[PDB]
């Protein structure tokens, strides 16, 4: 029965705990179950959403900080269970929406606009003063994780999304990922992330957390896809412009030259997903190398 | 019945496979089972053994390269099963002994001498042309792994040992560790290994693979406790003597200064356990810092 | 079951009445039952509590204005029932704490500090 009576309380809130994990024989596989809390969101007191699209693959920490530690021994998976809840921890005296729906094709520009968003399954945004859940039709093909690079489509379903458009004031809520995985084929190996540029091209082909874009007028880009305190360590040759500067960042530690052929290091402490740091060396892409360990 | 008849074949040999792994609820723990192959041995055409003592703890790769990847999420364990077999893959036209017995107190000088060895349980050496096994009375206390340092006694049972004394020629055999562990308390974290010296003292207090000793007359020491190709990266201040030299080593990659305050890097490819590399800076211990990731 | 769902309403409130009293033979005694409203409290928009410690004895009006009229004929007592309720008559749009715990030794300085308070039963 909807009807009559409704209590939109001043405040509503939930109480979630601390998922302790569960697992299976040989047959040719292991398994898992969720409990992660994938970044939040932050106001939006504006009239156009704004998305944090986060990518899904057994190893993409920016979506798994506790399970990206048991895929360094396998290669391939499953999913059988996985949903995202908007925990709900912010009174009703606040409002708007908190879009939240996944798109297999975990990679492609979010739109720019709603309708655009409000046309791609997932479905389900609600207000920030309530507790919602989200679920995904999961398939059944033995897909491989990324000990790199590849192609963002043959290796992982697709990224997740989340928008929220409102103006009444608050620090909305949080979410995770309800899941249960299948990790076939016994392998074993990995670490950081080491990612070299080859004069013609680059090389991130061994587990991520940052994407290295550049903005023309060479001034450059040195980024993240994951969140936590890190230990950088790396890259080199023509020690130009600068290096290792930072902007939407947490603590920096550089104990390098500049280098015009040197060596370098830093410790980040990030903020919410995707904070950036950069060098400065010319005009058009070739360089040297680097490796980014999480810590 | 021993008696009468015996066939010490020219050749005997075994056929071991490829252990695929098995695991349990929440209760307050997970589990495991062995399948590792802990370094070999190498002739000894001499009259005094010679030991490779290898240390045992859920995280000490030089004794677990496939399970030191699922203890970055817990802290404490068990053991319920663990034995070492001398696989046997070398004809009888070769001989001597291959001592092999563990000593709880996994840390202390091996002796120097046999009797010494032949007096410490374990028991069991046999010739190299046969297939033997080894087993250990395992306890039952909730011990903690090393997200460092500590004390080598309150954190891990004790190291293993292996000697072999002979002269007839061959590359004896190989062994592993039959086991089943208990990893209580849900934690999660770690990496390399980062290990700083503080003018008064040092700091390896976050997962190993090398021990840094120095030999007086400063010329120094930069070592291993684990085996594989690595990615060094590190340490600095008064860029003295040298740095990053190497001796019982595999491929080296240094892309540093010297530094007198710089930065450095190298890739090892080792050989059998414990190969060494070194710097050169004065006289008496204080310096800077470093981090050694396995890769 | 605590879990899931909770409604901290804007407002909550109660409705208490007007206790009319009840009493026994000779044996060597009489009896009673509560219904008093011992002083309130008043804000505290500050970071250190602040106490009104009120004393308990059949005759101490500052804790009995309706029973200190029937102890002028006896001398000695009991207690068998006695509890203090924070009636609750003020919306949630307000908050803090309202410590409230008795200490047999009905006389001695309140502390000065909480922990001190937050260490004495009640």
Residues in CB range of C4: below 8 A, 6 or more apart: A14, A15
Q: Which two tokens stand for residue A285?
A: 């892409």
A53 Cβ neighbours under 8 A, 6+ residues apart: A110, A159, A160, A161, A162
Q: Which two tokens stand for residue A26?
A: 């040989």
Two structure tokens written together for C24: 């026994």
- Distance of alpha carbon A87 from alpha carbon A174, whole angstroms: 5
Pairing of strands A291-293, A265-266: unpaired
**Which of A26, A184, A263, A288 is the best substitution to test chain B (most B C-beta atoms within 10 A)?**
A263
Judge contact between C61 and C68, C-beta under 8 A: yes
A113 to each of A108, A110, A163, A295, how far by Cα in Å?
14, 8, 11, 37
Question: Burial of A255 by CB count in 10 Å (0-12 exposed, 13-18 middle, 19+ buried)?
Answer: buried
What residue has token string 């000490």?
B60
C4: which chain A residues are within 8 Å (Cβ-Cβ)?
14-15
Bridge partners of residue B190, in order along the sequence: none
Residue A154 contacts by C-beta under 8 Å, 6 or more apart in sequence?
A143, A144
Which DSSP string corresponds to B183-196? --SB-------B--
Under an 8 A CB cutoff, do A14 and C5 touch?
Answer: yes
Which alpha helices (DSSP H) does chain A contain, by range?
Answer: 114-117
Same fold, A1-189 and A190-295: no
- Quick check: B23 and A24 CB within 8 A? yes
The residue of A17, A18, A20 whose CB has the most chain B CBs within 10 angstroms, and thus the best one to mutate to test that interface, is: A20
- Cross-chain Cβ contact A233/B291 below 8 Å: yes
Q: Are B185 and B76 in contact (CB under 8 A)?
A: yes
Sequence-distant (6+) residues with CB within 8 A of C80 are C31
Chain B residues at the A interface, defined by Cβ less than 8 Å, are 18, 20-26, 28, 30, 65-66, 69-70, 72-73, 186, 188, 191-192, 194, 231, 233-234, 236, 255-257, 262-265, 291, 293-295
Cross-chain CB nearest to C8 (options A11, A14, A15): A11
Token pair 């252990």: residue: B19
Chain B residues with CB-CB distance to A72 below 8 A: 69
DSSP for A159-180, written as a single string: -B--B----S-----------B
Among candidates C2, C4, C7 on the partner chain, residue whose Cβ is nearest the Cβ of A9 = C7
In this structure, is the dihedral angle defined by the CA atoms of residues A282, A284, A287 and A289, taken in order, positive or negative? positive
Q: How far is the C-alpha of B208 from the C-alpha of A193, rounded, in Å?
A: 19
Angle A127-A132-A137 (CA atoms, 0-180°, nearest 5)? 125
Query: Do A276 and A223 form a contact (C-beta atoms < 8 A)?
Result: yes
B137 burial via Cβ count (<10 Å: 0-12, 13-18, 19+) = exposed
Residue for token digits 């190299």? B128
Domain boundaries, chain A: 1-189, 190-295
Sheet containing B291-293: which strands, arranged edge to edge?
A: B265-266, B231-233, B291-293
Q: How many whole angstroms separate alpha carbon C38 and alpha carbon C61?
A: 9
Nearest to A186 among B20, B186, B194 (CB): B20
Choose from A5, A6, A7, A10 for mutation: most chain C CBs within 10 A. Answer: A10
Structurally, what CATH architecture does the domain formed by C1-122 represent? Sandwich (2.60)
Q: How far apart are CA B229 and CA B206, in angstroms?
A: 20
Using the structure block, give the residue that is written with the tokens 């974290």: B189
Separation of first and last alpha carbons in chain B: 52
Bridge partner list, B81: B180
For the domain A1-189, what is the CATH code? 2.60.120.20
Q: How was this structure determined?
A: X-ray
| Secondary-structure class of domain A190-295 per CATH | mainly beta
Whose CA is closest to A98, among A112, A83, A88, A109?
A88
Q: Tokens for A100?
A: 């939240």
Least Cα separation, residue A243 to chain B (angstroms): 14
Which run of H or E residues covers position B245? strand B245-246
> What's the resolution in A?
3.2
| A10, A11, A15 member nearest C3 (Cβ) | A15
């Amino acid at each position: 029965q909807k009807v009559t009576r409704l209590s939109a309380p001043v405040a509503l809130a939930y109480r979630e705990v601390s998922t302790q994990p569960r697992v299976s024989t040989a047959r040719d596989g292991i398994t898992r179950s969720g409990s992660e809390l994938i970044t939040t969101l932050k106001k939006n007191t504006d009239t156009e959403p704004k998305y944090t699209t986060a990518v899904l693959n057994p190893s993409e920490p920016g979506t798994f900080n506790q399970l990206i530690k048991e895929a360094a021994q396998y290669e391939k998976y499953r999913f059988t269970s996985l949903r995202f809840r908007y925990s709900p921890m912010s009174p009703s005296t606040t409002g708007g929406k908190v879009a939240l729906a996944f798109d297999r094709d975990a990679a492609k520009p979010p739109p720019n606009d709603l309708a655009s968003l409000y046309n791609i399954e997932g479905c389900v945004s609600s207000v920030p003063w309530t507790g919602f859940i989200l679920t995904v039709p999961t398939d059944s093909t033995d897909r491989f994780v990324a000990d790199g690079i590849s192609d963002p489509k043959l290796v992982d379903f697709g990224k997740l999304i989340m928008a929220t458009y409102g103006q009444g004031a608050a620090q909305l809520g949080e979410v995770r990922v309800e899941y249960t995985v299948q990790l076939k084929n016994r392998t074993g190996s990995t670490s950081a992330q080491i990612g070299d540029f080859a004069g013609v091209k680059d090389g991130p082909r061994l587990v991520s957390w940052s994407k290295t874009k550049g903005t023309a007028g060479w001034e450059h880009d040195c980024h993240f896809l994951g969140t936590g305190n890190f230990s950088l360590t790396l890259f080199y040759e023509k020690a130009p412009v600068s290096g290792l500067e930072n902007a939407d960042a947490s603590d920096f530690s550089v104990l390098g030259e500049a280098a015009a052929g040197s060596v370098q290091w830093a410790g980040v402490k990030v903020a919410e997903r995707g904070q950036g740091v950069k060098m400065v060396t010319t005009e058009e892409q070739p360089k040297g190398k680097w490796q980014a360990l999480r810590i």
